Amino acid sequence: KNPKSDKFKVKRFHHIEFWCGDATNVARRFSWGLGMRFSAKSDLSTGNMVHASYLLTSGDLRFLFTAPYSPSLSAGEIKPTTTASIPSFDHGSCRSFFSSHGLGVRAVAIEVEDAESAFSISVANGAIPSSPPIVLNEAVTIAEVKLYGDVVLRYVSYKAFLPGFERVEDASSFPLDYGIRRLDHAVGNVPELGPALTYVAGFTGFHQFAEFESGLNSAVLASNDEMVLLPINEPVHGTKRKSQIQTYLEHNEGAGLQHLALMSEDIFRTLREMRKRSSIGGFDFMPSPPPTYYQNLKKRVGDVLSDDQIKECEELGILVDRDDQGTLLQIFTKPLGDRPTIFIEIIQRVGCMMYQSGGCGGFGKGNFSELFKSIEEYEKTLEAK
Amino acid sequence: KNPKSDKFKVKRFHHIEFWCGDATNVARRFSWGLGMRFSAKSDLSTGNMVHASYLLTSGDLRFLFTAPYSPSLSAGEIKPTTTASIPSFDHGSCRSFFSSHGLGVRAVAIEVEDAESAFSISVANGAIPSSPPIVLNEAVTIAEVKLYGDVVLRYVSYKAFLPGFERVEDASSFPLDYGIRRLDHAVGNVPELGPALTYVAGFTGFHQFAEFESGLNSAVLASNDEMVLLPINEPVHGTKRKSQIQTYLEHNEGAGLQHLALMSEDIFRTLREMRKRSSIGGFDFMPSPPPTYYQNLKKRVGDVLSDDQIKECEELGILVDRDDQGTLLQIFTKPLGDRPTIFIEIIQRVGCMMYQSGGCGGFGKGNFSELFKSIEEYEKTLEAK
Ligand SMILES: Cc1c(C(=O)c2c[nH]n(C)c2=O)ccc2nnn(C(C)C)c(=O)c12
Numbered sequence: 001k002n003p004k005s006d007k008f009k010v011k012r013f014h015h016i017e018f019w020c021g022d023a024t025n026v027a028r029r030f031s032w033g034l035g036m037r038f039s040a041k042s043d044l045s046t047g048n049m050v051h052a053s054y055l056l057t058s059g060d061l062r063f064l065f066t067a068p069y070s071p072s073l074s075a076g077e078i079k080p081t082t083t084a085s086i087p088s089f090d091h092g093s094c095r096s097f098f099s100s101h102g103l104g105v106r107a108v109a110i111e112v113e114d115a116e117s118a119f120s121i122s123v124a125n126g127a128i129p130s131s132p133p134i135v136l137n138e139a140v141t142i143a144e145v146k147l148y149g150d151v152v153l154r155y156v157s158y159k160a161f162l163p164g165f166e167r168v169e170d171a172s173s174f175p176l177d178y179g180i181r182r183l184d185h186a187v188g189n190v191p192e193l194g195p196a197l198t199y200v201a202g203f204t205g206f207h208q209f210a211e212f213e214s215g216l217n218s219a220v221l222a223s224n225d226e227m228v229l230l231p232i233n234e235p236v237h238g239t240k241r242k243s244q245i246q247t248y249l250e251h252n253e254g255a256g257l258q259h260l261a262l263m264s265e266d267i268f269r270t271l272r273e274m275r276k277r278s279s280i281g282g283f284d285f286m287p288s289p290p291p292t293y294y295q296n297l298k299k300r301v302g303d304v305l306s307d308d309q310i311k312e313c314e315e316l317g318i319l320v321d322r323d324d325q326g327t328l329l330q331i332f333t334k335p336l337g338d339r340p341t342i343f344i345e346i347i348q349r350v351g352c353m354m355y356q357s358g359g360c361g362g363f364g365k366g367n368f369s370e371l372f373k374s375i376e377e378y379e380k381t382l383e384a385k
Numbered sequence: 386k387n388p389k390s391d392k393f394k395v396k397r398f399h400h401i402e403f404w405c406g407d408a409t410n411v412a413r414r415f416s417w418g419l420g421m422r423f424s425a426k427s428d429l430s431t432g433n434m435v436h437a438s439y440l441l442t443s444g445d446l447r448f449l450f451t452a453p454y455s456p457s458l459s460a461g462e463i464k465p466t467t468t469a470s471i472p473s474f475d476h477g478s479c480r481s482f483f484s485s486h487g488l489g490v491r492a493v494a495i496e497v498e499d500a501e502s503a504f505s506i507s508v509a510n511g512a513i514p515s516s517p518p519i520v521l522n523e524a525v526t527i528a529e530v531k532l533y534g535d536v537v538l539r540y541v542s543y544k545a546f547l548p549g550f551e552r553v554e555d556a557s558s559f560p561l562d563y564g565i566r567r568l569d570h571a572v573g574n575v576p577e578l579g580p581a582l583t584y585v586a587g588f589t590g591f592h593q594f595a596e597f598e599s600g601l602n603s604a605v606l607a608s609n610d611e612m613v614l615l616p617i618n619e620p621v622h623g624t625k626r627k628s629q630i631q632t633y634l635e636h637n638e639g640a641g642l643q644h645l646a647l648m649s650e651d652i653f654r655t656l657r658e659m660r661k662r663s664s665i666g667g668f669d670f671m672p673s674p675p676p677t678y679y680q681n682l683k684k685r686v687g688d689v690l691s692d693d694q695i696k697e698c699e700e701l702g703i704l705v706d707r708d709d710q711g712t713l714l715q716i717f718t719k720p721l722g723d724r725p726t727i728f729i730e731i732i733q734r735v736g737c738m739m740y741q742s743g744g745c746g747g748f749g750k751g752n753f754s755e756l757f758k759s760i761e762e763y764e765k766t767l768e769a770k
């Protein structure tokens with residue numbers, strides 16, 4: 001049941017902004033590791049004396065990497081005379097964010113029909129303001145409200161990347177592509193799920209998205225057409241193995257974005273490409289499930305995936321779960337940086353054709369149980385041996 | 386003339402430590418871009434609750450990348466009970482360094498016979514102390530004194546990487562190698578050369594190394610066998626084109642390390658490998674000199690390099706200079722990070738065989754003149770056209 005109760009018109013995920021210490025090195029590492037091309041920049045070479053911002057793209061996926069210059073470079077400036085291309089940026093906030101959380105997501109940006117109205121309605125409905133609506137070059141409006149922790153939800157709307165950004169010279173823009181195409185969902189970790197859900201659903205009108213002992217409780221908020229999907233987790237205390245949600249909050253110094261799920265148009269090719277680069281500057285993946293997990297795949301997805309595709313899932317370490325409507329293939333990277341906080345999910349969904357409906361196949365909640373049972377069977381198999 | 390006046394026994398460059406915001410992403414980028422393998426780590430997985438440190442190696446070259454965790458993780462600790470593997474590390478200092486300078490070199494480390502005596506003698510001779518001698522696991526002694534700006538000169542001595550570091554698992558250690566073999570020299574930029582030279586030569590006993598209108602004055606300090614080479618630059622003001630040394634001081638917020646020169650055993654192969662990766666996560670190089678520069682190469686190094694090697698220098702953008710004792714091949718990267726501050730030089734020296742004597746061929750000072758004349762001739766050639 002989707003009551004379609006959005007309080008403003010939301011279109012789709014627009015971009016994700018990382019706040020970095022050095023945006024150059026993070027962006028180059030992500031570009032090689034994820035197969036995203038350098039598409040736009042705003043830095044000293046474009047007249048920005050305030051921050052360095054580099055944009056990577058793959059299909060519709062946009063990752064923005066931003067870091068501050070020395071404040072001394074823009075000492076003469078005031079907000080009305082700023083050279084920053086993102087006027088919500090603030091040296092002090094950026095340094096405090098990164099000092100407090102390390103590398104991670106500052107902004108989850110969604111495209112809306114009218115960012116000014118989205119901001120007004122949001123705050124009228126309980127959102128905590130972060131940056132007021134600002135119109136850039138009479139062409140794009142940006143506004144920001146607090147989402148959770150130090151993460152903001154950013155509204156962007158276009159009259160017809162951003163003004164002040166320059167498209168990147170083809171020589172520096174190598175056309176990497178490993179198959180990633182868009183942001184599927186963006187997941188937050190919070191100390192208390194209930195108040196976080198009430199707050200965000202409160203000011204967006206986003207509804208609970210229906211789903212279907214291991215560290216978390218979660219719920220998913222969704223836009224009208226369910227193409228903007230915002231899951232939120234809380235830890236469950238008093239277990240035997242410590243909650244990874246609690247571990248996150250400790251190392252992140254509080255709530256923040258936990259993982260970004262990136263849709264691939266061919267998850268086999270994405271994972272082959274990413275795995276070739278894991279030890280030469282790219283991203284590492286979580287340890288693969290045991291062969292028992294994959295033997296168990298025939299009995300639950302044998303009608304969707306052939307035996308060859310199931311064994312290709314096994315070679316690549318890919319997980320599979322299924323809804324009543326569709327099938328999901330997924331895998332998780334190790335943490336993106338020094339701290340055991342943010343990671344990335346690669347995902348591809350099968351089914352729910354009408355275009356594919358958002359969230360088709362769920363989010364893989366069933367894989368917590370299947371991973372447990374598969375690890376237990378595998379140990380018993382070898383113990384027997 | 387080398388008066389061999391070192392005040393303690395200095396062996397060779399040991400390592401260079403970068404202070405980072407996220408050590409994971411900088412280290413992976415450098416590894417791919419320079420062809421250095423992951424060799425050792427000290428982080429949460431080794432019991433270090435204070436900092437993440439990752440060591441890359443190529444031949445004898447050691448790059449250490451370090452970033453702080455949340456101070457909350459080590460709140461219970463005191464220096465006598467620390468889990469840090471580098472006891473001079475300090476959260477506040479590291480955050481201030483990076484906030485002030487961005488990505489750059491915190492420590493130039495040299496191996497000495499006795500780090501405690503090197504520290505005592507240094508301070509007795511004017512060095513400003515930074516971290517007192519500390520003996521690690523009864524096996525290695527580390528001490529630090531101020532060099533210039535927020536850069537320290539670090540002494541390391543071994544009884545027989547560092548205690549508390551673990552060697553890295555072969556799977557995560559891909560044996561990259563593009564030919565780089567050791568640190569040749571490490572160059573500082575300061576506002577006033579005279580007092581910097583007096584200070585450092587004062588407490589080391591290092592002597593001036595003999596050399597042979599464009600932005601700088603420089604001088605080179607050297608150890609007894611001239612294998613530790615520490616050039617220092619100051620800007621020259623009142624020129625037409627602004628001094629790149631002054632630009633550095635402005636964007637770096639004061640003095641600091643300007644470039645690291647990395648010796649290659651085959652600079653042609655290094656530059657081919659590095660240039661293939663420039664647009665896929667590696668390092669970019671300065672714009673190549675015009676063809677006139679390379680036509681002029683025959684008249685000054687035609688006796689050292691064949692016409693094929695000279696045209697291979699041209700394909701790769703390599704510079705050539707020569708002393709009265711040896712020949713030098715060199716090239717410069719664009720800045721390593723967001724700010725126009727630190728960069729890297731790749732170098733290979735021809736001559737002075739006895740082993741090769743340090744500094745053989747100089748540092749390429751003659752290339753400032755040759756680059757000017759070559760750019761002038763090339764423009765006149767095309768202007769004529
Ligand atoms: C992150 C994750 C998801 C996931 O992505 C979501 C779960 N709920 N929602 C809304 C989601 O987006 C699904 C199954 C998983 N199974 N095992 N693991 C281990 C490596 C610890 C997971 O991390 C894991």
Ligand SMILES: Cc1c(C(=O)c2c[nH]n(C)c2=O)ccc2nnn(C(C)C)c(=O)c12
Nearest residue numbers: 572603616671717730748749750752753756
């Ligand atoms: C850095 C550099 C050196 C160098 O490495 C040293 C010069 N003196 N000492 C002690 C050194 O180590 C030599 C010649 C150069 N010619 N042109 N350029 C332009 C790209 C701006 C240089 O940057 C350049």
Ligand SMILES: [Co+2]
Nearest residue numbers: 187261345363
């Ligand atoms: Co997910």
Ligand SMILES: [Co+2]
Nearest residue numbers: 572646730748
């Ligand atoms: Co040099």
